[PDB]
Amino acid sequence: TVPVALVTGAAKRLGRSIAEGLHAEGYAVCLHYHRSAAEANALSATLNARRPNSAITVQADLSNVATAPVGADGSAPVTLFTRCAELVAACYTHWGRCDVLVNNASSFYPTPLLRGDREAMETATADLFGSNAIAPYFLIKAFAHRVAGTPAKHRGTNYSIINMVDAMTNQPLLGYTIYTMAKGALEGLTRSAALELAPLQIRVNGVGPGLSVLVDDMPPAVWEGHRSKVPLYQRDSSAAEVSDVVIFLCSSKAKYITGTCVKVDGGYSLTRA
Amino acid sequence: TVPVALVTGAAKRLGRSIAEGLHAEGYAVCLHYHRSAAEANALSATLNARRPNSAITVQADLSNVATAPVAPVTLFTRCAELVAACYTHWGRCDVLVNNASSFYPTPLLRREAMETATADLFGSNAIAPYFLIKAFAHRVAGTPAKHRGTNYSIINMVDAMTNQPLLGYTIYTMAKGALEGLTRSAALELAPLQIRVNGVGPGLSVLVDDMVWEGHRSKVPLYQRDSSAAEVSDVVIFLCSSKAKYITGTCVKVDGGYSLTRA
Amino acid sequence: VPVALVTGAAKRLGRSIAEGLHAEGYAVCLHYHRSAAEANALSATLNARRPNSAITVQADLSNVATAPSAPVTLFTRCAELVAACYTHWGRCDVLVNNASSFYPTPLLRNDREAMETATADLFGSNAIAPYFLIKAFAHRVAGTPAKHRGTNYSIINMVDAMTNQPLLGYTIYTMAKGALEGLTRSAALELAPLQIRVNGVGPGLSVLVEGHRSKVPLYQRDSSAAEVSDVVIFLCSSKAKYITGTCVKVDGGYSLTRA
Amino acid sequence: TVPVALVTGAAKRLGRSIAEGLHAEGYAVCLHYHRSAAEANALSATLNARRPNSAITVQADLSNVATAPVADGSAPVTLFTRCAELVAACYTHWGRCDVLVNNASSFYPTPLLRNGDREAMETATADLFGSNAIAPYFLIKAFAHRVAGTPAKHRGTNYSIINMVDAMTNQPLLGYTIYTMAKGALEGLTRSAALELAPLQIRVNGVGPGLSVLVDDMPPAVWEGHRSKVPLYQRDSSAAEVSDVVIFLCSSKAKYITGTCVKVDGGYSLTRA
Ligand SMILES: NC(=O)c1ccc[n+]([C@@H]2O[C@H](COP(=O)([O-])OP(=O)(O)OC[C@H]3O[C@@H](n4cnc5c(N)ncnc54)[C@H](OP(=O)(O)O)[C@@H]3O)[C@@H](O)[C@H]2O)c1
Ligand SMILES: NC(=O)c1ccc[n+]([C@@H]2O[C@H](COP(=O)([O-])OP(=O)(O)OC[C@H]3O[C@@H](n4cnc5c(N)ncnc54)[C@H](OP(=O)(O)O)[C@@H]3O)[C@@H](O)[C@H]2O)c1
Ligand SMILES: NC(=O)c1ccc[n+]([C@@H]2O[C@H](COP(=O)([O-])OP(=O)(O)OC[C@H]3O[C@@H](n4cnc5c(N)ncnc54)[C@H](OP(=O)(O)O)[C@@H]3O)[C@@H](O)[C@H]2O)c1
Ligand SMILES: NC(=O)c1ccc[n+]([C@@H]2O[C@H](COP(=O)([O-])OP(=O)(O)OC[C@H]3O[C@@H](n4cnc5c(N)ncnc54)[C@H](OP(=O)(O)O)[C@@H]3O)[C@@H](O)[C@H]2O)c1
Ligand SMILES: COC(=O)C1CCN(C(=O)c2ccc(NCc3cnc4nc(N)nc(N)c4n3)cc2)CC1
Ligand SMILES: COC(=O)C1CCN(C(=O)c2ccc(NCc3cnc4nc(N)nc(N)c4n3)cc2)CC1
Ligand SMILES: COC(=O)C1CCN(C(=O)c2ccc(NCc3cnc4nc(N)nc(N)c4n3)cc2)CC1
Ligand SMILES: COC(=O)C1CCN(C(=O)c2ccc(NCc3cnc4nc(N)nc(N)c4n3)cc2)CC1
């Protein structure tokens, strides 16, 4: 009877803020994580403490690789598609529903054209394309099938899919090609899924941050200079300044919106060198 | 500290729903109208009944023309006077919604009406907005930083569908392209004053039953209908809320996936 | 012998476009506003290489009234431009909307008349004159009996690669270019049945009158005039006959940059 | 002395016309193919007949799969390896590669929604993404590497990369999600590679057809019905109407253009339902 949100990469930063923002609205939240088990279980505890049985954690590698079956007798590697189906399944198993999907998990590191390895280049392609593009596709598919399979009478009235894209990829970041192409893929998914799932009343939108919760592992004057180029406030956003938009888009007040993106970027994309 | 919204073309349809939506969030509302005096006054009455002194009306032709006093008055002056009306009455203006807009054909293919059409469609949709944003920014720049609002917001009502131009509506389409440029340019220049500038583009919203009505309706992917006024205004209201304080220079399409379509 | 009308033809890109079209065989109507000397000299060069292959026509393209029956509107001056082509050579196959004022209209200081002249000048040259010119052009074609019509009608609007990344203080200019982009799309749709193609070409930084230069990813300079005009010429060629309603950025990657 | 173009999926339709159009401008042309051996060899023969040693054919599956071991004896060949060998082929035979056209592309439905069912699935993802996006990336990588490796004194003066994108993908075709995502990934690559390869004076641009040489495998009236939708001419383009734009972009006349797309669609993207 309570709406259910699945949030990938939910353990920290903008994914946490999204899970939290949805939770404040009344959602039960499936918190996905890959490597951040401690932070995800802690976040779950906070949410459950405020409202019993309003959170769970599920672990999955969203890289475009087949994982190992759980080396022994009777099985076959688990495809990304299956791990994605199981994520959505986790929501139906536990709460009997899934109303909101947020595709937030994403790897982000350089793949330069101009310059051990083989494994680097192979793994990077799978990981960056998986997390940013191919997993969202399969996740959206599982999500869609399970609404299609729900008798109209038992269906939700506010199905929403949010894809976290990037406001800045038309102005690409030097050396981040695979990432950038993956976000471009994700933007196509938004449009194409919004079109094909319209008859089911599944809305599909994007939210593209500019600079948000900027990692500060660098000279302060450099961190500071990066920041200062956002026209608005001359700083990166907080997590909530992004997650609040995600929340609105999922609200029944946004039910005519589909197939679109909202940049949250402090006018950063308006800039030129 | 009641914040003040100026909404152009506020008397009916989407402008009314925006005035109402902002009113419900606590704004005092300057309702601009041109010809729809009766409807604007009635709406002001509703809002004032709910909350005393929370609404006024001001009349202005937003066409790019000079008018008379019975000095012809230029569009720039009428625009400045709109923003000034807000300061005179409540001593502030926090929100501006550029909503008023003419919309009729200017076919390229089968000089009196040509020029008045140009002035009207360009003025309402583009030039008046520019002047309004100018007046708005000047009043803020002139307010000592101590006494400034904390959530200045300008929303331009654009069009989701103008990349897929409506046949025979060239001037209108160009004016909306001009408005999109104003959104980006104003968002950049006013950032240092923390004035956010965004657009909202409806697709098909609140169709008068021109008969065919079912024709257009039926190729909106989402729901196969046009939107209600609130389905648009709610987005406007969000964009004006402090929760949307990192958003500037951008547009939100409210079109039910309509722009995703092809012939 | 096809005819091109080129607004703002006296110097810089307008001149390189006139020249580039002339080298392809076009007769060229060179429009100018103030640059009479330069336009007449250019016309002399072109006529010397090929007799009667160029003329000059003067018009303020600002959205004002000027000079006489009674005040002459922008619409009329625009019609007269296209008419000059038909009168002299009995045709007009290519239109290039190139003429364009470009100067600041700040929202924040750092009155009035300067603003109401600026509005009419920047919107007129960049957007309103183009519309009327496109209108005049389309009517002359619609009125030509089909068997007597050209086979490669082309309109090119000079837009701006960089206006999604607005130049600080240039709001009316930017809005006018956004207006011109809509004209491109709208005219391309409505004139398709007459086989009039309508496209845009957007320079980044071209022929600067260096800080800015060094910011361009490709070559770290501004373009030459020909680096822009050659694109225009291609779009006008029969090889480009399936292209309409689109823009080409000629910007050296400049619009790919961020601050 | 003679500039060299590599054209992927060159055997037929738009890729043949591109190879032909480059050939007419003086290029030697590496014509890659996958399943169309006969057409590619026949096209090579025409080009060689017209100008001796001005064409070669080379075969590669550009699907994102590992392939042809040394019956085997050993290790699987990576897509990246096959891609590098394509560009290598050009250097081995003619000592250069000036132009790369990423034209090969698979195109068939991947519906979100229902009514070889997971090999099909898996092979669709690798094939659509591979041909349309991942192989282009690796090809662009190999190409840039060989230029970077060329002493500036032995470097060509007109290096050009063209990615065949799609004018219509912002108006997505119902049921072709993966294809659409893949083209959005290719658009990312265009922008990103244009930025990163600028310092080596490698230009990187896209050309997006609307409807070109439309397959007529359907009731005439339905075929006529589809073309009739194009506002310009009410027909699909010919192959040359597309390839001539490609050729222009590669010409020295286009040397200031990089990081952009050119729609060749007859105004088709300007339409709405
Ligand atoms: N922050 C920004 O300035 C910014 C800017 C533009 C766009 N965005 C987009 O906004 C979203 C959120 O931003 P963010 O900064 O919060 O993201 P983030 O901190 O970089 O990480 C998001 C989460 O994604 C998960 N992830 C990465 N690769 C994965 C894989 N192979 N399999 C499963 N999960 C994987 C990680 O989960 P675990 O820790 O559990 O392993 C990570 O915690 C991302 O999609 C991002 O690309 C962010
Ligand atoms: N409705 C849609 O499907 C749709 C679609 C795309 C975009 N939009 C945009 O959304 C906004 C609102 O849509 P709408 O249908 O509610 O608007 P609307 O009914 O067509 O008109 C809005 C108001 O604009 C005022 N107006 C028109 N010309 C004016 C002028 N010369 N001077 C001063 N006021 C003038 C009129 O005020 P008076 O009645 O007082 O004279 C009119 O009531 C418009 O900007 C529109 O372009 C709407
Ligand atoms: N150069 C660049 O870096 C750049 C960048 C982006 C876009 N563009 C676009 O490309 C085009 C050409 O650029 P450009 O630098 O060569 O242009 P430009 O030198 O600034 O000026 C073009 C011509 O426009 C004419 N003009 C200006 N105002 C006019 C008016 N009111 N009525 C009639 N003519 C008027 C002038 O003609 P007269 O001299 O005869 O008076 C001028 O020579 C322009 O549309 C421009 O916006 C250029
Ligand atoms: N035709 C159109 O209306 C249209 C519209 C929009 C965009 N485009 C784009 O323009 C380009 C050309 O159009 P087109 O219609 O000529 O293309 P096409 O006929 O469908 O096929 C292009 C070639 O791609 C090759 N290819 C497909 N999958 C491959 C793979 N897994 N590995 C290696 N090669 C593979 C095929 O080569 P083999 O035959 O040798 O196996 C095929 O002949 C494509 O990128 C397309 O996306 C075309
Ligand atoms: C080779 O390295 C370089 O050339 C630069 C890359 C940019 N750089 C940065 O510090 C930096 C970090 C984040 C930037 N963008 C914000 C962003 C975008 N997308 C993201 N996606 C995910 N998944 N996670 C993020 N944190 C993220 N951040 C931009 C620049 C310094 C070194
Ligand atoms: C020459 O006439 C024609 O070719 C068509 C034009 C489209 N048509 C319509 O009924 C129609 C009406 C509104 C349409 N768009 C919605 C829209 C967009 N912008 C607007 N702006 C303002 N200011 N007001 C509106 N109502 C408005 N509506 C699209 C088609 C039938 C006749
Ligand atoms: C208030 O002044 C300023 O803030 C800056 C404005 C930018 N500036 C420049 O030197 C400058 C000049 C041209 C620039 N863009 C190229 C451009 C774009 N459009 C044009 N349109 C026309 N019609 N003519 C041009 N020359 C032109 N140039 C960008 C920056 C220094 C001072
Ligand atoms: C599930 O099937 C359907 O719903 C429709 C799909 C569209 N359809 C078509 O006949 C069709 C064919 C090509 C269309 N687009 C042109 C196009 C775009 N990209 C392409 N890419 C490649 N690689 N090859 C092409 N031939 C190609 N064609 C659009 C519609 C009929 C059935």
PDB file of N, CA and C in Angstrom, chain C residues 96-140:
ATOM      1  N   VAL C  96      21.449  34.770 -48.900  1.00  0.00           N
ATOM      2  CA  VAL C  96      22.268  34.612 -47.731  1.00  0.00           C
ATOM      3  C   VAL C  96      21.960  35.761 -46.774  1.00  0.00           C
ATOM      4  N   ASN C  97      21.348  35.426 -45.641  1.00  0.00           N
ATOM      5  CA  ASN C  97      21.114  36.456 -44.612  1.00  0.00           C
ATOM      6  C   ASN C  97      22.342  36.580 -43.730  1.00  0.00           C
ATOM      7  N   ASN C  98      23.210  37.491 -44.092  1.00  0.00           N
ATOM      8  CA  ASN C  98      24.519  37.630 -43.461  1.00  0.00           C
ATOM      9  C   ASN C  98      24.624  38.916 -42.663  1.00  0.00           C
ATOM     10  N   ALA C  99      24.038  39.990 -43.190  1.00  0.00           N
ATOM     11  CA  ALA C  99      24.143  41.316 -42.498  1.00  0.00           C
ATOM     12  C   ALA C  99      23.653  41.234 -41.037  1.00  0.00           C
ATOM     13  N   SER C 100      24.348  41.907 -40.120  1.00  0.00           N
ATOM     14  CA  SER C 100      24.107  41.655 -38.698  1.00  0.00           C
ATOM     15  C   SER C 100      24.858  42.583 -37.779  1.00  0.00           C
ATOM     16  N   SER C 101      24.107  43.387 -37.018  1.00  0.00           N
ATOM     17  CA  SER C 101      24.761  44.245 -36.015  1.00  0.00           C
ATOM     18  C   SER C 101      25.078  43.406 -34.778  1.00  0.00           C
ATOM     19  N   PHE C 102      26.108  43.815 -34.047  1.00  0.00           N
ATOM     20  CA  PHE C 102      26.660  43.021 -32.942  1.00  0.00           C
ATOM     21  C   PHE C 102      27.371  44.001 -32.004  1.00  0.00           C
ATOM     22  N   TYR C 103      26.688  44.321 -30.900  1.00  0.00           N
ATOM     23  CA  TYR C 103      27.259  45.141 -29.848  1.00  0.00           C
ATOM     24  C   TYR C 103      26.441  44.913 -28.586  1.00  0.00           C
ATOM     25  N   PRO C 104      26.988  45.339 -27.432  1.00  0.00           N
ATOM     26  CA  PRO C 104      26.393  45.031 -26.108  1.00  0.00           C
ATOM     27  C   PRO C 104      25.049  45.604 -25.826  1.00  0.00           C
ATOM     28  N   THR C 105      24.169  44.826 -25.218  1.00  0.00           N
ATOM     29  CA  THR C 105      23.007  45.410 -24.537  1.00  0.00           C
ATOM     30  C   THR C 105      22.914  44.882 -23.122  1.00  0.00           C
ATOM     31  N   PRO C 106      23.705  45.435 -22.198  1.00  0.00           N
ATOM     32  CA  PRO C 106      23.818  44.871 -20.851  1.00  0.00           C
ATOM     33  C   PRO C 106      22.511  44.962 -20.095  1.00  0.00           C
ATOM     34  N   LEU C 107      22.255  43.941 -19.285  1.00  0.00           N
ATOM     35  CA  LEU C 107      21.125  43.992 -18.353  1.00  0.00           C
ATOM     36  C   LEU C 107      21.571  44.659 -17.084  1.00  0.00           C
ATOM     37  N   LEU C 108      22.860  44.531 -16.761  1.00  0.00           N
ATOM     38  CA  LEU C 108      23.377  45.121 -15.533  1.00  0.00           C
ATOM     39  C   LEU C 108      24.490  46.092 -15.820  1.00  0.00           C
ATOM     40  N   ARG C 109      24.145  47.380 -15.719  1.00  0.00           N
ATOM     41  CA  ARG C 109      25.038  48.540 -15.867  1.00  0.00           C
ATOM     42  C   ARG C 109      26.518  48.227 -15.995  1.00  0.00           C
ATOM     43  N   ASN C 110      27.133  48.000 -14.833  1.00  0.00           N
ATOM     44  CA  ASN C 110      28.594  47.990 -14.645  1.00  0.00           C
ATOM     45  C   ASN C 110      29.233  49.361 -14.892  1.00  0.00           C
ATOM     46  N   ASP C 111      19.583  56.787 -20.966  1.00  0.00           N
ATOM     47  CA  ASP C 111      19.004  55.465 -21.160  1.00  0.00           C
ATOM     48  C   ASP C 111      18.257  55.378 -22.487  1.00  0.00           C
ATOM     49  N   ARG C 112      17.421  54.339 -22.599  1.00  0.00           N
ATOM     50  CA  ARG C 112      16.187  54.337 -23.394  1.00  0.00           C
ATOM     51  C   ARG C 112      16.356  54.315 -24.908  1.00  0.00           C
ATOM     52  N   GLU C 113      16.548  55.502 -25.501  1.00  0.00           N
ATOM     53  CA  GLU C 113      16.774  55.690 -26.961  1.00  0.00           C
ATOM     54  C   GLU C 113      17.858  54.743 -27.509  1.00  0.00           C
ATOM     55  N   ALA C 114      19.094  54.946 -27.064  1.00  0.00           N
ATOM     56  CA  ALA C 114      20.164  53.981 -27.260  1.00  0.00           C
ATOM     57  C   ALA C 114      19.650  52.534 -27.164  1.00  0.00           C
ATOM     58  N   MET C 115      18.601  52.317 -26.358  1.00  0.00           N
ATOM     59  CA  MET C 115      18.036  50.982 -26.153  1.00  0.00           C
ATOM     60  C   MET C 115      16.958  50.632 -27.197  1.00  0.00           C
ATOM     61  N   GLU C 116      16.094  51.599 -27.525  1.00  0.00           N
ATOM     62  CA  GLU C 116      15.092  51.446 -28.571  1.00  0.00           C
ATOM     63  C   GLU C 116      15.624  51.504 -29.991  1.00  0.00           C
ATOM     64  N   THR C 117      16.779  52.162 -30.229  1.00  0.00           N
ATOM     65  CA  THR C 117      17.566  52.076 -31.495  1.00  0.00           C
ATOM     66  C   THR C 117      18.311  50.756 -31.606  1.00  0.00           C
ATOM     67  N   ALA C 118      18.889  50.329 -30.484  1.00  0.00           N
ATOM     68  CA  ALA C 118      19.605  49.061 -30.384  1.00  0.00           C
ATOM     69  C   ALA C 118      18.690  47.906 -30.625  1.00  0.00           C
ATOM     70  N   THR C 119      17.541  47.921 -30.002  1.00  0.00           N
ATOM     71  CA  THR C 119      16.563  46.862 -30.202  1.00  0.00           C
ATOM     72  C   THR C 119      16.173  46.723 -31.682  1.00  0.00           C
ATOM     73  N   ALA C 120      15.936  47.840 -32.373  1.00  0.00           N
ATOM     74  CA  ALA C 120      15.478  47.829 -33.763  1.00  0.00           C
ATOM     75  C   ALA C 120      16.582  47.453 -34.739  1.00  0.00           C
ATOM     76  N   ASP C 121      17.782  47.827 -34.380  1.00  0.00           N
ATOM     77  CA  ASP C 121      18.934  47.528 -35.190  1.00  0.00           C
ATOM     78  C   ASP C 121      19.356  46.057 -35.043  1.00  0.00           C
ATOM     79  N   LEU C 122      19.415  45.538 -33.814  1.00  0.00           N
ATOM     80  CA  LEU C 122      19.963  44.214 -33.594  1.00  0.00           C
ATOM     81  C   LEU C 122      18.937  43.186 -33.936  1.00  0.00           C
ATOM     82  N   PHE C 123      17.692  43.399 -33.520  1.00  0.00           N
ATOM     83  CA  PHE C 123      16.645  42.505 -33.975  1.00  0.00           C
ATOM     84  C   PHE C 123      16.339  42.563 -35.442  1.00  0.00           C
ATOM     85  N   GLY C 124      16.452  43.743 -36.033  1.00  0.00           N
ATOM     86  CA  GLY C 124      16.102  43.916 -37.435  1.00  0.00           C
ATOM     87  C   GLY C 124      17.060  43.163 -38.328  1.00  0.00           C
ATOM     88  N   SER C 125      18.340  43.461 -38.157  1.00  0.00           N
ATOM     89  CA  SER C 125      19.357  42.972 -39.057  1.00  0.00           C
ATOM     90  C   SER C 125      19.465  41.471 -38.914  1.00  0.00           C
ATOM     91  N   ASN C 126      19.408  40.996 -37.660  1.00  0.00           N
ATOM     92  CA  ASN C 126      19.660  39.615 -37.328  1.00  0.00           C
ATOM     93  C   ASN C 126      18.448  38.684 -37.480  1.00  0.00           C
ATOM     94  N   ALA C 127      17.229  39.222 -37.480  1.00  0.00           N
ATOM     95  CA  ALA C 127      16.032  38.403 -37.397  1.00  0.00           C
ATOM     96  C   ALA C 127      14.845  38.885 -38.221  1.00  0.00           C
ATOM     97  N   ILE C 128      14.433  40.137 -38.028  1.00  0.00           N
ATOM     98  CA  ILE C 128      13.231  40.626 -38.695  1.00  0.00           C
ATOM     99  C   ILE C 128      13.443  40.854 -40.204  1.00  0.00           C
ATOM    100  N   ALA C 129      14.584  41.463 -40.592  1.00  0.00           N
ATOM    101  CA  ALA C 129      14.904  41.594 -42.021  1.00  0.00           C
ATOM    102  C   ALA C 129      15.012  40.231 -42.695  1.00  0.00           C
ATOM    103  N   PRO C 130      15.754  39.274 -42.128  1.00  0.00           N
ATOM    104  CA  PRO C 130      15.771  37.911 -42.664  1.00  0.00           C
ATOM    105  C   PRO C 130      14.399  37.315 -42.944  1.00  0.00           C
ATOM    106  N   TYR C 131      13.466  37.471 -42.015  1.00  0.00           N
ATOM    107  CA  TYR C 131      12.116  36.979 -42.206  1.00  0.00           C
ATOM    108  C   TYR C 131      11.441  37.600 -43.423  1.00  0.00           C
ATOM    109  N   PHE C 132      11.510  38.928 -43.540  1.00  0.00           N
ATOM    110  CA  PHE C 132      10.887  39.628 -44.641  1.00  0.00           C
ATOM    111  C   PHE C 132      11.561  39.292 -45.952  1.00  0.00           C
ATOM    112  N   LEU C 133      12.859  39.092 -45.913  1.00  0.00           N
ATOM    113  CA  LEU C 133      13.621  38.762 -47.121  1.00  0.00           C
ATOM    114  C   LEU C 133      13.214  37.392 -47.585  1.00  0.00           C
ATOM    115  N   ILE C 134      13.179  36.445 -46.647  1.00  0.00           N
ATOM    116  CA  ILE C 134      12.665  35.079 -46.936  1.00  0.00           C
ATOM    117  C   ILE C 134      11.235  35.088 -47.500  1.00  0.00           C
ATOM    118  N   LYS C 135      10.401  35.952 -46.941  1.00  0.00           N
ATOM    119  CA  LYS C 135       9.033  36.142 -47.437  1.00  0.00           C
ATOM    120  C   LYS C 135       9.016  36.623 -48.892  1.00  0.00           C
ATOM    121  N   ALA C 136       9.766  37.682 -49.164  1.00  0.00           N
ATOM    122  CA  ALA C 136       9.827  38.257 -50.518  1.00  0.00           C
ATOM    123  C   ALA C 136      10.340  37.216 -51.552  1.00  0.00           C
ATOM    124  N   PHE C 137      11.436  36.590 -51.181  1.00  0.00           N
ATOM    125  CA  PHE C 137      12.061  35.506 -51.925  1.00  0.00           C
ATOM    126  C   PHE C 137      11.083  34.393 -52.257  1.00  0.00           C
ATOM    127  N   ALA C 138      10.301  33.932 -51.272  1.00  0.00           N
ATOM    128  CA  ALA C 138       9.349  32.829 -51.466  1.00  0.00           C
ATOM    129  C   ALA C 138       8.190  33.205 -52.362  1.00  0.00           C
ATOM    130  N   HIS C 139       7.736  34.441 -52.229  1.00  0.00           N
ATOM    131  CA  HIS C 139       6.655  34.958 -53.059  1.00  0.00           C
ATOM    132  C   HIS C 139       7.132  35.028 -54.525  1.00  0.00           C
ATOM    133  N   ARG C 140       8.326  35.578 -54.767  1.00  0.00           N
ATOM    134  CA  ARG C 140       8.806  35.672 -56.167  1.00  0.00           C
ATOM    135  C   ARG C 140       8.861  34.268 -56.802  1.00  0.00           C
TER     136      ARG C 140
END
